[PDB]
Ligand binder design. Structure first.
Ligand SMILES: COc1ccc(CCc2nc3cc(-c4c(C)noc4C)ccn3c2NC2CCCCC2)cc1Cl
Length: 115
């Protein structure tokens, strides 16, 4: 099944917007983790493939997804990176858990509509 870039954008960008709408939970995710700025040199030792909302948005805007499960994969890579690196008591970790609940609800009917 072929998917057009604008078809993927029209279907999937509302689910990304739903994540941006989460406040405070989306705030640490709207831009890439910056280890130099945050003083965490070990970050890229642990997270070999960073992902964040702005990079997913750019990938959707520049047609880098050929199928919707590639978009889902990048959202879940965001989540898994954050659960992996951050302590379970931290804001980032608990915010990640909230985004995953939101995303699960938003993406389900959209994947049905795509087929
Ligand atoms: C309201 O929320 C917060 C407010 C302040 C803080 C401390 C500063 C801070 N700590 C992180 C951690 C990650 C991260 C992720 C994600 N995965 O691993 C790591 C590591 C990313 C950004 N951080 C930032 N910068 C801020 C976030 C908020 C908007 C502007 C930039 C924490 C949070 Cl929660």
């Amino acid at each position: 099944k072929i998917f057009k870039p604008e078809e993927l954008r029209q279907a999937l960008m509302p689910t990304l917007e739903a994540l941006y709408r989460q406040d405070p939970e989306s705030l640490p995710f709207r831009q890439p983790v910056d280890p130099q700025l945050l003083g965490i040199p070990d970050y890229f030792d642990i997270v070999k493939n960073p992902m964040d909302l702005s990079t997913i948005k750019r990938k959707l805007d520049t047609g880098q997804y050929q199928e919707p499960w590639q978009y889902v994969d990048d959202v879940w890579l965001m989540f898994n990176n954050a659960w992996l690196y951050n302590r379970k008591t931290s804001r980032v970790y608990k915010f990640c858990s909230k985004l995953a609940e939101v995303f699960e609800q938003e993406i389900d009917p959209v994947m049905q509509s795509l087929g």
